[PDB]
Amino acid sequence: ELEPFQKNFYIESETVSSMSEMEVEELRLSLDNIKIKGTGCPKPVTKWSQLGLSTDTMVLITKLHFGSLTPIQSQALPAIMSGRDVIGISKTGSGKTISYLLPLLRQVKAQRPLSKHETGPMGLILAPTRELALQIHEEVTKFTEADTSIRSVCCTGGSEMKKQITDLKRGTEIVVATPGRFIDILTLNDGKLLSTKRITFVVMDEADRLFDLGFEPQITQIMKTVRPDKQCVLFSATFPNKLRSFAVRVLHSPISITINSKGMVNENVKQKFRICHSEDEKFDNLVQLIHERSEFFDAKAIIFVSSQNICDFISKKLLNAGIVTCAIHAGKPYQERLMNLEKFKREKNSILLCTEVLSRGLNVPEVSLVIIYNAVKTFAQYVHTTGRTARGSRSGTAITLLLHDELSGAYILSKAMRDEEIKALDPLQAKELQEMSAKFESGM
Ligand code: NI
């Protein structure tokens, strides 16, 4: 008859809870393309203060972690603090450790102390190597140092067992261990020196490595002696089939968090840009682009603009210059939208001229060329506009005509383009891009 306990310690800050869904999508794209799976994921935070940690802890952390929250921290901290099981896929050095330590500290702190007959622990962190266990435990101590109500003992192989037994004699709220040693300690002396009965929180870090180094049997047996309503988080740089299979076995309604696994834009889309200095130059490029394309002759294009007034203007402009377009926007009667869409889907080598906001929902097949005439200002809009050309192997090209003053636009391009896409273009255009993006970035 299990003892009930609290796992959700998260109070969403007002400023975060005010965020809309579109805002949250955008924040995830900007944070190195965070991808989530699972139901009910809390919104990412962007500041240590949105987590409701005491001043002590705040001072301590800062001290402990210098600079901005990492993408993994932004998303994993509120999900774990909320008591959810979590799969966190991110590289070593992404700061993942505090992502689980803070919530673990909080959870263990809240539980009643160990009785005079209870060994502990309440929290268990498993690592595949002695070197990682020691590193994790060093972190832990930087927090248990201030607070004498909480101990951690590090239990690994390649190290005296008797030494660690002397520790565990005194009871311990937290254990950091390699799987073999832990199992060895559990079974030792009728399992009377270490109990699993009070473990409510298990973390497995570098989880892919645990299978690599043959620990499936040990970690599987450990999870079998742990209450199944425990909170469990699995952190790993990769997600091999073995881990995927293990998570299904040990987790409930997990939230998976993957940081920039793949590119925000399909890698088969060829992203390009041209930096211009007047609307006129932008228009000169747009025309050169439309003619040039013909020498490579389905093959259709879509010019994206930012407003209905711009769409009308550019439509007339392009007309006066011998180029006929199928123009579309929400200020036009639906009947003529349909006429233009059908004309576009009908006529060979047609050109659609469309507002960026209608891009996600356009009912047309993928195209060979997207010309973004007004650099978009969000990551979400960039994905929807460029995605109009995405088509696995048959993906075409998306090109942005950017103006010298469009700093945020350059920030987006610098974050969504592949490095090798920026290399193949003129090194001065490239250099301006990076300068534009840096200026925007320090602008905040
Ligand atoms: Ni310039």
Side-chain angles (χ1 to χ4, degrees), residues 2-36 38-54 56-59 61 65-115 117-161 164-191 193-260 263-295 297-323 325-347 349-392 395-419 421-422 424-444:
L2 267 358
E3 190 184 354
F5 71 98
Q6 177 175 2
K7 64 170 57 164
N8 185 345
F9 295 93
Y10 180 61
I11 307 183
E12 188 176 56
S13 71
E14 53 178 82
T15 139
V16 165
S17 74
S18 57
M19 294 177 68
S20 69
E21 193 156 327
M22 277 192 62
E23 231 153 327
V24 174
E25 168 187 32
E26 184 68 16
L27 183 51
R28 280 173 191 151
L29 286 167
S30 71
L31 279 186
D32 277 3
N33 190 29
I34 303 181
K35 289 291 188 258
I36 62 162
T39 294
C41 188
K43 310 162 178 180
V45 297
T46 60
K47 161 92 256 91
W48 288 113
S49 63
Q50 293 165 329
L51 296 156
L53 332 164
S54 173
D56 64 340
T57 298
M58 294 292 313
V59 188
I61 290 187
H65 187 282
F66 301 79
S68 290
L69 279 50
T70 60
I72 191 49
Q73 289 169 347
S74 290
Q75 185 60 83
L77 274 160
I80 301 173
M81 270 282 339
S82 298
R84 298 290 298 275
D85 283 2
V86 172
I87 303 187
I89 311 303
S90 68
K91 294 306 171 194
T92 322
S94 58
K96 56 186 169 162
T97 300
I98 58 102
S99 305
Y100 61 75
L101 303 180
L102 284 191
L104 190 135
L105 266 341
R106 182 105 75 104
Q107 188 185 115
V108 287
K109 282 184 186 155
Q111 263 185 310
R112 56 174 182 90
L114 295 172
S115 74
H117 40 284
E118 289 167 348
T119 60
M122 282 144 276
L124 171 72
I125 298 167
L126 296 170
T129 68
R130 176 162 190 270
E131 289 76 25
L132 185 67
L134 292 163
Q135 185 187 302
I136 290 165
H137 166 80
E138 196 61 37
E139 256 96 7
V140 184
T141 66
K142 258 86 187 97
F143 288 92
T144 53
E145 270 169 12
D147 179 14
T148 61
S149 65
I150 288 188
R151 305 192 56 225
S152 167
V153 179
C154 179
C155 295
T156 72
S159 192
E160 289 98 354
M161 163 100 74
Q164 57 213 202
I165 302 180
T166 89
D167 296 325
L168 302 164
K169 133 210 170 205
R170 281 93 67 115
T172 188
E173 293 78 35
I174 294 177
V175 174
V176 184
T178 47
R181 182 52 56 97
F182 188 68
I183 277 304
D184 285 345
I185 288 164
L186 270 192
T187 58
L188 184 158
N189 195 17
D190 286 297
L193 80 162
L194 211 281
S195 189
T196 64
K197 295 191 116 63
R198 290 212 55 184
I199 303 182
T200 56
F201 202 150
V202 184
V203 171
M204 299 199 206
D205 199 3
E206 300 194 20
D208 51 354
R209 303 260 286 145
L210 302 163
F211 297 89
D212 281 358
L213 307 185
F215 291 118
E216 188 182 337
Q218 295 64 42
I219 66 180
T220 297
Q221 179 188 331
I222 292 175
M223 294 318 281
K224 300 212 63 65
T225 77
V226 169
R227 60 190 293 170
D229 56 334
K230 81 300 164 191
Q231 172 174 18
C232 181
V233 337
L234 268 23
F235 274 13
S236 179
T238 71
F239 197 39
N241 293 338
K242 265 299 184 180
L243 182 43
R244 180 171 325 263
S245 174
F246 186 73
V248 168
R249 284 192 303 274
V250 314
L251 301 182
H252 293 114
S253 320
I255 301 159
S256 69
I257 301 167
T258 306
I259 315 288
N260 214 14
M264 176 178 313
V265 178
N266 181 282
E267 71 179 330
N268 297 133
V269 177
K270 285 122 270 186
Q271 307 179 42
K272 294 175 185 159
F273 68 94
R274 276 132 87 125
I275 298 191
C276 296
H277 300 83
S278 65
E279 284 284 334
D280 310 286
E281 183 176 17
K282 276 211 307 184
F283 182 83
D284 295 332
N285 280 265
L286 176 65
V287 177
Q288 161 203 333
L289 285 169
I290 291 160
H291 291 148
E292 282 181 2
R293 169 182 71 114
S294 70
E295 324 290 349
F297 291 157
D298 196 9
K300 20 196 60 152
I302 298 155
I303 301 144
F304 283 117
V305 296
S306 55
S307 80
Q308 308 172 358
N309 295 343
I310 294 173
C311 189
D312 291 336
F313 179 91
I314 295 305
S315 179
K316 175 42 73 67
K317 268 276 261 198
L318 291 177
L319 190 53
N320 288 337
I323 309 158
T325 59
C326 302
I328 288 294
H329 75 71
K332 296 189 180 318
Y334 90 94
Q335 298 103 319
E336 71 160 321
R337 288 184 220 140
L338 281 176
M339 290 234 87
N340 291 341
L341 287 163
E342 197 165 5
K343 179 160 180 268
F344 175 77
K345 278 177 281 182
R346 237 176 56 244
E347 289 174 11
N349 302 144
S350 44
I351 297 174
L352 194 69
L353 174 56
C354 187
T355 47
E356 65 193 35
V357 300
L358 302 183
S359 73
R360 186 187 187 182
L362 279 175
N363 296 329
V364 296
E366 303 309 281
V367 296
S368 59
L369 184 66
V370 174
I371 305 178
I372 297 169
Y373 183 88
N374 304 96
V376 315
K377 294 231 194 321
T378 67
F379 285 110
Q381 207 53 282
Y382 189 68
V383 175
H384 298 323
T385 46
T386 69
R388 274 291 143 186
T389 184
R391 215 235 176 256
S395 290
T397 301
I399 175 168
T400 286
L401 303 177
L402 181 71
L403 293 162
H404 180 114
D405 306 314
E406 284 175 328
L407 307 183
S408 72
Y411 178 78
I412 292 162
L413 292 158
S414 79
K415 294 312 167 182
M417 286 179 86
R418 302 167 86 252
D419 319 76
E421 286 173 322
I422 307 179
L425 304 176
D426 180 277
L428 298 168
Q429 294 268 120
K431 185 22 156 48
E432 211 183 330
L433 193 79
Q434 296 299 347
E435 275 165 356
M436 293 179 182
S437 176
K439 184 62 187 182
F440 169 87
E441 192 158 24
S442 70
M444 70 189 178

